[PDB]
Amino acid sequence: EEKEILWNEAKAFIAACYQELGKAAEVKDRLADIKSEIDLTGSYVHTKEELEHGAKMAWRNSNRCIGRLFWNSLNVIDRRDVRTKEEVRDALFHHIETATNNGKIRPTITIFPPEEKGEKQVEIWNHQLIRYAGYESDGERIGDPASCSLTAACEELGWRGERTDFDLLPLIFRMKGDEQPVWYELPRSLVIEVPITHPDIEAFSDLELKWYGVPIISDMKLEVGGIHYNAAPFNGWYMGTEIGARNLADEKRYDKLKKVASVIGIAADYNTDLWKDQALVELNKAVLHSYKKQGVSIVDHHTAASQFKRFEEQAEEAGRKLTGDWTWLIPPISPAATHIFHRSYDNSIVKPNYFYQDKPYE
Amino acid sequence: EEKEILWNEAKAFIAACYQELGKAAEVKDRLADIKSEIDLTGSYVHTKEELEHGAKMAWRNSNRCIGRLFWNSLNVIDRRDVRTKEEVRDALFHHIETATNNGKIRPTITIFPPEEKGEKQVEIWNHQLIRYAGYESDGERIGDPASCSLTAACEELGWRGERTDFDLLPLIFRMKGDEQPVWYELPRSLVIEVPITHPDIEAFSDLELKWYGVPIISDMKLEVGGIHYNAAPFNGWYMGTEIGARNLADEKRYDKLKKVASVIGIAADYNTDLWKDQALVELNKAVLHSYKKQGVSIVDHHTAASQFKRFEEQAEEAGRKLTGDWTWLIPPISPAATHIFHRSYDNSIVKPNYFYQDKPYE
Ligand code: HEM
Ligand code: HEM
Ligand SMILES: Cc1cc(N)nc(CCc2ccc(CCCN)c(CCc3cc(C)cc(N)n3)c2)c1
Ligand SMILES: Cc1cc(N)nc(CCc2ccc(CCCN)c(CCc3cc(C)cc(N)n3)c2)c1
Ligand SMILES: [Cl-]
Ligand SMILES: [Cl-]
């Protein structure tokens, strides 16, 4: 059963991948080889060409992603050779460095050895490789509340945060055969951060807001032809709203809208003044302005939606069905100002793809 | 078959309606009466109590409506006695007057005789009782593009618009047995309109925008216990975003965002300036301000979402399942600033309800 799942998934992937690569004639022989290998070993090993194209397909099939136009230029780093925690740490440090690329962000994925018997070889605990800690001790809230449980887990293992609102969490991952994960403090030279200022309102700097340059999702599983790559961190560049309308704005995150309203000099007293809406717009302008000013890649939601329209056209033109999650594709700011809002999307799951998996803590 | 549909729907409705009315014991006798009546006549007639509560239930079950907190105070006008076009016209005029209520809008529905053999007794052509005409002659666009096809149909029947951007369409409806609908110009004394000004920006009046006070949806079918009330116009008061973020903002409607940007004194050149977002916020502030200043009921999307939260709690507290369409419930401005955005809703259809029906023109 488990291996029939593998063979069926392998069949579909190799056929599809090789068609896209103009390698359709090699499918028959390659499947024989794969079938023998599953027979003789219980699994199979992707060629580097398969691995790279599979990761790209997986991005292409990510229903919730507005940035998919650029799927085919994903920079895929093959790290299936890794066996030690030093090698993992160094691969993660390297991913941060090459993806950041001095601000000119490169969409990158580093792929670690896949699950064996559903047994992980490398288990990453971080949600993102770069993220801020969060604390909640006796009524006082510090940092990013979304990081509270991971932060508590790190502090169990002998890490201690400075309890600033922007403590960088350490890298934390466990190796197969180890009982506890290890942690490593991020070298600050690796991590670009951007201070948030506003183009016109000088007082905006009084909020002392900042955010990190590169979102590197490190807790999803990449699945390709029945192989489960549970550890495969990937990054793009930010869409501004992710920072200005969610990370810094949500009541359950940094919750900064009342403070924004005060520095931009409007009252925060009446719903009918639309002060939250006005504060959201200004904070979002500041975020775009700040990233651009520092030379760190970022895209606004209008340009993003325009790019996504092109992805849609490209898919049609290539004869591929389009899939999407409307509820995630619409930006959280002026959604009806984008074309996305005014059409519908088929939310079917197509593989290869990226999937949620259970957290190893909490 | 057709009558088995009717009896099954009647069974479910009478049971449910009478439970809610504390009249559970009368269900058995009432169903016998109904069953005989379908047997003897092919249909049945609602008591006034059933009709009123059914219309209220229908509002309660409208998945796409954020305003449902107030379902139980709907003002139901029973006009099943109507037989002539003068009576229909007068009932429609009356609905406008009593719903408008000098600006203190009353959620109201007027219910006309239901379909007989799927044969309409009264067929209303208007989408809303009050709406602006739209024209598109040889490249030049005037008025509301959404009204183009109905406007063309009216002008076929000998009506002529002044071709202002805000021509009030005439009431247009057809009677059973008539080949053509009739039309009647709206008395302007009946129709409250609001000029759009901004609380701080004096130049905003230069846009000469306005909108009508009361949205009265007149093209949906109310279904109650298997009876099809195809003509049953209903109204609430506006949520500000419907006007500021859609009617006046959409590129396929009045398309005013570039003009808004100019009068509020910002450039409309770069996506990263979020000029569309900023223009949307200011236009939406102006709309709320203008309605409030004139004494015409309106609700902002924050207050609306707060009221909807109470509807949710009320439903749970009453032991009723909640249904909703997330894609319509989220406001088109700052949706993530409402609780709606952060939860999910079951989009199942529960009856009684309001349903789309085919337009009799186009
Ligand atoms: C190149 C720049 C990119 C941009 C601007 C972008 C934009 C976004 C945005 C805005 C979201 C939505 C998050 C939310 O709604 O809060 C998202 C989700 C997602 N993106 Fe992208 N993205 C990019 C690159 C990538 C890459 C390189 C991958 C993987 C190879 C990827 C895969 C995904 C996935 C899987 C999700 C869903 C995450 C989840 O379900 O939690 N994206 N993207
Ligand atoms: C009391 C004030 C009311 C407010 C503020 C309100 C608010 C809204 C809003 C914002 C929409 C969405 C339109 C859109 O997304 O563009 C809507 C849709 C709807 N509302 Fe309400 N509403 C109210 C009263 C009513 C009443 C009295 C009824 C019927 C008895 C009703 C039934 C509906 C229905 C059926 C829709 C869906 C229309 C469609 O599918 O095209 N609402 N409402
Ligand atoms: C690779 C990449 C690039 C980029 N610009 N953005 C992303 C998405 C980042 C991200 C990270 C974390 C999260 C939190 C939940 C995921 N377990 C999210 C999604 C946030 C969200 C929350 C809600 C309530 C709705 C919604 N649509 N989206 C999105 C990935
Ligand atoms: C009774 C009532 C009160 C009130 N405040 N609002 C309404 C809804 C009015 C309305 C009128 C017309 C329409 C146009 C289509 C309906 N055939 C709409 C819905 C507009 C819309 C468009 C799009 C693209 C998405 C969306 N969610 N909603 C909404 C009814
Ligand atoms: Cl993020
Ligand atoms: Cl409307």
PDB file of N, CA, C and O in Angstrom, chain B residues 121-170:
ATOM      1  N   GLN B 121     -46.841  36.774 -11.739  1.00  0.00           N
ATOM      2  CA  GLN B 121     -48.003  37.656 -11.737  1.00  0.00           C
ATOM      3  C   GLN B 121     -47.527  39.074 -11.992  1.00  0.00           C
ATOM      4  O   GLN B 121     -48.209  39.879 -12.636  1.00  0.00           O
ATOM      5  N   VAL B 122     -46.350  39.371 -11.452  1.00  0.00           N
ATOM      6  CA  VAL B 122     -45.726  40.676 -11.570  1.00  0.00           C
ATOM      7  C   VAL B 122     -44.249  40.403 -11.807  1.00  0.00           C
ATOM      8  O   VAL B 122     -43.633  39.621 -11.077  1.00  0.00           O
ATOM      9  N   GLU B 123     -43.689  41.036 -12.834  1.00  0.00           N
ATOM     10  CA  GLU B 123     -42.296  40.833 -13.221  1.00  0.00           C
ATOM     11  C   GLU B 123     -41.536  42.175 -13.182  1.00  0.00           C
ATOM     12  O   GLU B 123     -41.686  43.007 -14.073  1.00  0.00           O
ATOM     13  N   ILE B 124     -40.733  42.390 -12.144  1.00  0.00           N
ATOM     14  CA  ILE B 124     -39.995  43.654 -12.013  1.00  0.00           C
ATOM     15  C   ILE B 124     -38.688  43.617 -12.814  1.00  0.00           C
ATOM     16  O   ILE B 124     -37.890  42.683 -12.665  1.00  0.00           O
ATOM     17  N   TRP B 125     -38.462  44.621 -13.662  1.00  0.00           N
ATOM     18  CA  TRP B 125     -37.241  44.648 -14.482  1.00  0.00           C
ATOM     19  C   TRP B 125     -36.048  45.318 -13.803  1.00  0.00           C
ATOM     20  O   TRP B 125     -34.891  44.964 -14.079  1.00  0.00           O
ATOM     21  N   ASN B 126     -36.320  46.275 -12.920  1.00  0.00           N
ATOM     22  CA  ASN B 126     -35.250  46.984 -12.217  1.00  0.00           C
ATOM     23  C   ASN B 126     -34.387  46.055 -11.388  1.00  0.00           C
ATOM     24  O   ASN B 126     -34.894  45.084 -10.806  1.00  0.00           O
ATOM     25  N   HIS B 127     -33.090  46.364 -11.315  1.00  0.00           N
ATOM     26  CA  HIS B 127     -32.210  45.672 -10.383  1.00  0.00           C
ATOM     27  C   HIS B 127     -32.414  46.252  -8.981  1.00  0.00           C
ATOM     28  O   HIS B 127     -32.532  45.513  -7.996  1.00  0.00           O
ATOM     29  N   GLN B 128     -32.438  47.579  -8.889  1.00  0.00           N
ATOM     30  CA  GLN B 128     -32.864  48.258  -7.667  1.00  0.00           C
ATOM     31  C   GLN B 128     -33.950  49.238  -8.034  1.00  0.00           C
ATOM     32  O   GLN B 128     -33.970  49.719  -9.161  1.00  0.00           O
ATOM     33  N   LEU B 129     -34.851  49.537  -7.094  1.00  0.00           N
ATOM     34  CA  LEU B 129     -35.936  50.476  -7.377  1.00  0.00           C
ATOM     35  C   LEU B 129     -35.385  51.869  -7.700  1.00  0.00           C
ATOM     36  O   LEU B 129     -35.925  52.583  -8.551  1.00  0.00           O
ATOM     37  N   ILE B 130     -34.305  52.247  -7.022  1.00  0.00           N
ATOM     38  CA  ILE B 130     -33.628  53.502  -7.333  1.00  0.00           C
ATOM     39  C   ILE B 130     -32.229  53.175  -7.843  1.00  0.00           C
ATOM     40  O   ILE B 130     -31.425  52.573  -7.116  1.00  0.00           O
ATOM     41  N   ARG B 131     -31.937  53.547  -9.090  1.00  0.00           N
ATOM     42  CA  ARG B 131     -30.611  53.335  -9.664  1.00  0.00           C
ATOM     43  C   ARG B 131     -30.380  54.306 -10.813  1.00  0.00           C
ATOM     44  O   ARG B 131     -31.335  54.825 -11.378  1.00  0.00           O
ATOM     45  N   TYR B 132     -29.114  54.544 -11.160  1.00  0.00           N
ATOM     46  CA  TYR B 132     -28.801  55.519 -12.201  1.00  0.00           C
ATOM     47  C   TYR B 132     -28.635  54.828 -13.537  1.00  0.00           C
ATOM     48  O   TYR B 132     -28.148  53.703 -13.594  1.00  0.00           O
ATOM     49  N   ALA B 133     -29.039  55.513 -14.603  1.00  0.00           N
ATOM     50  CA  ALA B 133     -28.935  54.995 -15.956  1.00  0.00           C
ATOM     51  C   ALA B 133     -27.481  54.979 -16.398  1.00  0.00           C
ATOM     52  O   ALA B 133     -26.627  55.649 -15.800  1.00  0.00           O
ATOM     53  N   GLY B 134     -27.207  54.223 -17.454  1.00  0.00           N
ATOM     54  CA  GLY B 134     -25.871  54.155 -18.024  1.00  0.00           C
ATOM     55  C   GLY B 134     -25.935  54.135 -19.536  1.00  0.00           C
ATOM     56  O   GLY B 134     -26.824  53.510 -20.119  1.00  0.00           O
ATOM     57  N   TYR B 135     -24.996  54.823 -20.180  1.00  0.00           N
ATOM     58  CA  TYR B 135     -24.988  54.924 -21.631  1.00  0.00           C
ATOM     59  C   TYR B 135     -23.585  54.708 -22.166  1.00  0.00           C
ATOM     60  O   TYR B 135     -22.592  55.050 -21.516  1.00  0.00           O
ATOM     61  N   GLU B 136     -23.520  54.153 -23.368  1.00  0.00           N
ATOM     62  CA  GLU B 136     -22.266  53.870 -24.042  1.00  0.00           C
ATOM     63  C   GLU B 136     -22.584  54.000 -25.520  1.00  0.00           C
ATOM     64  O   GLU B 136     -23.020  53.040 -26.164  1.00  0.00           O
ATOM     65  N   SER B 137     -22.439  55.213 -26.043  1.00  0.00           N
ATOM     66  CA  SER B 137     -22.683  55.450 -27.461  1.00  0.00           C
ATOM     67  C   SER B 137     -21.401  55.913 -28.126  1.00  0.00           C
ATOM     68  O   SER B 137     -20.908  57.009 -27.837  1.00  0.00           O
ATOM     69  N   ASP B 138     -20.857  55.061 -28.991  1.00  0.00           N
ATOM     70  CA  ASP B 138     -19.749  55.448 -29.850  1.00  0.00           C
ATOM     71  C   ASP B 138     -18.573  55.960 -29.014  1.00  0.00           C
ATOM     72  O   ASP B 138     -18.133  57.100 -29.176  1.00  0.00           O
ATOM     73  N   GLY B 139     -18.098  55.130 -28.089  1.00  0.00           N
ATOM     74  CA  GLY B 139     -16.927  55.467 -27.300  1.00  0.00           C
ATOM     75  C   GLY B 139     -17.170  56.320 -26.065  1.00  0.00           C
ATOM     76  O   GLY B 139     -16.392  56.246 -25.111  1.00  0.00           O
ATOM     77  N   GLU B 140     -18.225  57.134 -26.070  1.00  0.00           N
ATOM     78  CA  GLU B 140     -18.499  57.977 -24.908  1.00  0.00           C
ATOM     79  C   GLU B 140     -19.343  57.248 -23.857  1.00  0.00           C
ATOM     80  O   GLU B 140     -20.400  56.689 -24.165  1.00  0.00           O
ATOM     81  N   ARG B 141     -18.841  57.238 -22.621  1.00  0.00           N
ATOM     82  CA  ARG B 141     -19.515  56.587 -21.504  1.00  0.00           C
ATOM     83  C   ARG B 141     -20.126  57.610 -20.540  1.00  0.00           C
ATOM     84  O   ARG B 141     -19.447  58.533 -20.077  1.00  0.00           O
ATOM     85  N   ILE B 142     -21.412  57.441 -20.252  1.00  0.00           N
ATOM     86  CA  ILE B 142     -22.122  58.337 -19.349  1.00  0.00           C
ATOM     87  C   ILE B 142     -22.855  57.514 -18.302  1.00  0.00           C
ATOM     88  O   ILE B 142     -23.468  56.487 -18.635  1.00  0.00           O
ATOM     89  N   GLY B 143     -22.788  57.941 -17.039  1.00  0.00           N
ATOM     90  CA  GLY B 143     -23.555  57.285 -15.991  1.00  0.00           C
ATOM     91  C   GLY B 143     -22.986  55.957 -15.514  1.00  0.00           C
ATOM     92  O   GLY B 143     -21.769  55.747 -15.559  1.00  0.00           O
ATOM     93  N   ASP B 144     -23.861  55.065 -15.049  1.00  0.00           N
ATOM     94  CA  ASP B 144     -23.446  53.809 -14.417  1.00  0.00           C
ATOM     95  C   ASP B 144     -23.408  52.680 -15.443  1.00  0.00           C
ATOM     96  O   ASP B 144     -24.464  52.218 -15.879  1.00  0.00           O
ATOM     97  N   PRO B 145     -22.194  52.210 -15.816  1.00  0.00           N
ATOM     98  CA  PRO B 145     -22.099  51.189 -16.867  1.00  0.00           C
ATOM     99  C   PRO B 145     -22.887  49.941 -16.507  1.00  0.00           C
ATOM    100  O   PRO B 145     -23.277  49.197 -17.408  1.00  0.00           O
ATOM    101  N   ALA B 146     -23.107  49.706 -15.216  1.00  0.00           N
ATOM    102  CA  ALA B 146     -23.820  48.505 -14.808  1.00  0.00           C
ATOM    103  C   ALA B 146     -25.290  48.568 -15.226  1.00  0.00           C
ATOM    104  O   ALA B 146     -25.972  47.539 -15.246  1.00  0.00           O
ATOM    105  N   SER B 147     -25.770  49.768 -15.562  1.00  0.00           N
ATOM    106  CA  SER B 147     -27.169  49.962 -15.948  1.00  0.00           C
ATOM    107  C   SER B 147     -27.402  50.006 -17.454  1.00  0.00           C
ATOM    108  O   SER B 147     -28.535  50.210 -17.891  1.00  0.00           O
ATOM    109  N   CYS B 148     -26.344  49.807 -18.239  1.00  0.00           N
ATOM    110  CA  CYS B 148     -26.415  49.975 -19.689  1.00  0.00           C
ATOM    111  C   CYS B 148     -27.498  49.171 -20.361  1.00  0.00           C
ATOM    112  O   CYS B 148     -28.252  49.701 -21.177  1.00  0.00           O
ATOM    113  N   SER B 149     -27.581  47.888 -20.032  1.00  0.00           N
ATOM    114  CA  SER B 149     -28.518  47.024 -20.743  1.00  0.00           C
ATOM    115  C   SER B 149     -29.969  47.342 -20.358  1.00  0.00           C
ATOM    116  O   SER B 149     -30.844  47.411 -21.226  1.00  0.00           O
ATOM    117  N   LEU B 150     -30.224  47.571 -19.073  1.00  0.00           N
ATOM    118  CA  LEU B 150     -31.570  47.965 -18.654  1.00  0.00           C
ATOM    119  C   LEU B 150     -31.924  49.327 -19.234  1.00  0.00           C
ATOM    120  O   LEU B 150     -33.060  49.548 -19.654  1.00  0.00           O
ATOM    121  N   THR B 151     -30.955  50.241 -19.252  1.00  0.00           N
ATOM    122  CA  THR B 151     -31.196  51.580 -19.785  1.00  0.00           C
ATOM    123  C   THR B 151     -31.614  51.479 -21.249  1.00  0.00           C
ATOM    124  O   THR B 151     -32.585  52.112 -21.678  1.00  0.00           O
ATOM    125  N   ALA B 152     -30.884  50.674 -22.016  1.00  0.00           N
ATOM    126  CA  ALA B 152     -31.225  50.453 -23.415  1.00  0.00           C
ATOM    127  C   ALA B 152     -32.625  49.861 -23.568  1.00  0.00           C
ATOM    128  O   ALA B 152     -33.354  50.190 -24.508  1.00  0.00           O
ATOM    129  N   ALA B 153     -33.004  48.976 -22.653  1.00  0.00           N
ATOM    130  CA  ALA B 153     -34.331  48.363 -22.725  1.00  0.00           C
ATOM    131  C   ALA B 153     -35.426  49.400 -22.457  1.00  0.00           C
ATOM    132  O   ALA B 153     -36.449  49.426 -23.155  1.00  0.00           O
ATOM    133  N   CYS B 154     -35.214  50.257 -21.454  1.00  0.00           N
ATOM    134  CA  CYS B 154     -36.155  51.349 -21.175  1.00  0.00           C
ATOM    135  C   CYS B 154     -36.308  52.251 -22.383  1.00  0.00           C
ATOM    136  O   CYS B 154     -37.426  52.603 -22.761  1.00  0.00           O
ATOM    137  N   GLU B 155     -35.190  52.611 -23.009  1.00  0.00           N
ATOM    138  CA  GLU B 155     -35.252  53.534 -24.140  1.00  0.00           C
ATOM    139  C   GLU B 155     -35.906  52.906 -25.359  1.00  0.00           C
ATOM    140  O   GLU B 155     -36.403  53.612 -26.228  1.00  0.00           O
ATOM    141  N   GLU B 156     -35.927  51.579 -25.408  1.00  0.00           N
ATOM    142  CA  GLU B 156     -36.702  50.883 -26.433  1.00  0.00           C
ATOM    143  C   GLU B 156     -38.188  51.156 -26.254  1.00  0.00           C
ATOM    144  O   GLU B 156     -38.919  51.300 -27.232  1.00  0.00           O
ATOM    145  N   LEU B 157     -38.620  51.249 -24.997  1.00  0.00           N
ATOM    146  CA  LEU B 157     -40.037  51.407 -24.669  1.00  0.00           C
ATOM    147  C   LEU B 157     -40.487  52.870 -24.595  1.00  0.00           C
ATOM    148  O   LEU B 157     -41.539  53.177 -24.016  1.00  0.00           O
ATOM    149  N   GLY B 158     -39.693  53.768 -25.177  1.00  0.00           N
ATOM    150  CA  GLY B 158     -40.098  55.158 -25.305  1.00  0.00           C
ATOM    151  C   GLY B 158     -39.686  56.082 -24.169  1.00  0.00           C
ATOM    152  O   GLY B 158     -40.046  57.261 -24.174  1.00  0.00           O
ATOM    153  N   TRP B 159     -38.957  55.561 -23.188  1.00  0.00           N
ATOM    154  CA  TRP B 159     -38.326  56.427 -22.193  1.00  0.00           C
ATOM    155  C   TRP B 159     -37.086  57.056 -22.828  1.00  0.00           C
ATOM    156  O   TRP B 159     -36.494  56.479 -23.747  1.00  0.00           O
ATOM    157  N   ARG B 160     -36.711  58.239 -22.353  1.00  0.00           N
ATOM    158  CA  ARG B 160     -35.487  58.896 -22.800  1.00  0.00           C
ATOM    159  C   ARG B 160     -34.781  59.514 -21.593  1.00  0.00           C
ATOM    160  O   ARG B 160     -35.388  60.272 -20.826  1.00  0.00           O
ATOM    161  N   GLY B 161     -33.511  59.164 -21.399  1.00  0.00           N
ATOM    162  CA  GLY B 161     -32.746  59.743 -20.309  1.00  0.00           C
ATOM    163  C   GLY B 161     -32.111  61.065 -20.716  1.00  0.00           C
ATOM    164  O   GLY B 161     -31.837  61.282 -21.905  1.00  0.00           O
ATOM    165  N   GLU B 162     -31.869  61.942 -19.740  1.00  0.00           N
ATOM    166  CA  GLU B 162     -31.220  63.227 -19.997  1.00  0.00           C
ATOM    167  C   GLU B 162     -29.720  63.090 -20.260  1.00  0.00           C
ATOM    168  O   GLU B 162     -29.069  64.068 -20.657  1.00  0.00           O
ATOM    169  N   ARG B 163     -29.187  61.894 -20.012  1.00  0.00           N
ATOM    170  CA  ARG B 163     -27.761  61.606 -20.221  1.00  0.00           C
ATOM    171  C   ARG B 163     -26.836  62.455 -19.361  1.00  0.00           C
ATOM    172  O   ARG B 163     -25.769  62.924 -19.785  1.00  0.00           O
ATOM    173  N   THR B 164     -27.278  62.623 -18.126  1.00  0.00           N
ATOM    174  CA  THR B 164     -26.483  63.153 -17.052  1.00  0.00           C
ATOM    175  C   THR B 164     -25.804  61.896 -16.465  1.00  0.00           C
ATOM    176  O   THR B 164     -26.182  60.780 -16.832  1.00  0.00           O
ATOM    177  N   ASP B 165     -24.796  62.044 -15.600  1.00  0.00           N
ATOM    178  CA  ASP B 165     -24.146  60.875 -15.002  1.00  0.00           C
ATOM    179  C   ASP B 165     -25.008  60.210 -13.933  1.00  0.00           C
ATOM    180  O   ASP B 165     -24.662  59.141 -13.430  1.00  0.00           O
ATOM    181  N   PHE B 166     -26.117  60.855 -13.580  1.00  0.00           N
ATOM    182  CA  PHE B 166     -26.993  60.369 -12.513  1.00  0.00           C
ATOM    183  C   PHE B 166     -28.479  60.468 -12.872  1.00  0.00           C
ATOM    184  O   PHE B 166     -29.277  60.987 -12.075  1.00  0.00           O
ATOM    185  N   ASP B 167     -28.855  59.998 -14.061  1.00  0.00           N
ATOM    186  CA  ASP B 167     -30.273  59.921 -14.430  1.00  0.00           C
ATOM    187  C   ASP B 167     -30.953  58.836 -13.602  1.00  0.00           C
ATOM    188  O   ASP B 167     -30.499  57.695 -13.600  1.00  0.00           O
ATOM    189  N   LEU B 168     -32.060  59.153 -12.939  1.00  0.00           N
ATOM    190  CA  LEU B 168     -32.802  58.115 -12.226  1.00  0.00           C
ATOM    191  C   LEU B 168     -33.556  57.275 -13.258  1.00  0.00           C
ATOM    192  O   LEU B 168     -34.322  57.813 -14.076  1.00  0.00           O
ATOM    193  N   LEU B 169     -33.342  55.961 -13.235  1.00  0.00           N
ATOM    194  CA  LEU B 169     -34.096  55.070 -14.115  1.00  0.00           C
ATOM    195  C   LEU B 169     -35.558  55.065 -13.680  1.00  0.00           C
ATOM    196  O   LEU B 169     -35.856  55.269 -12.493  1.00  0.00           O
ATOM    197  N   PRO B 170     -36.479  54.841 -14.631  1.00  0.00           N
ATOM    198  CA  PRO B 170     -37.892  54.757 -14.257  1.00  0.00           C
ATOM    199  C   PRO B 170     -38.145  53.389 -13.650  1.00  0.00           C
ATOM    200  O   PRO B 170     -37.333  52.480 -13.870  1.00  0.00           O
TER     201      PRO B 170
END
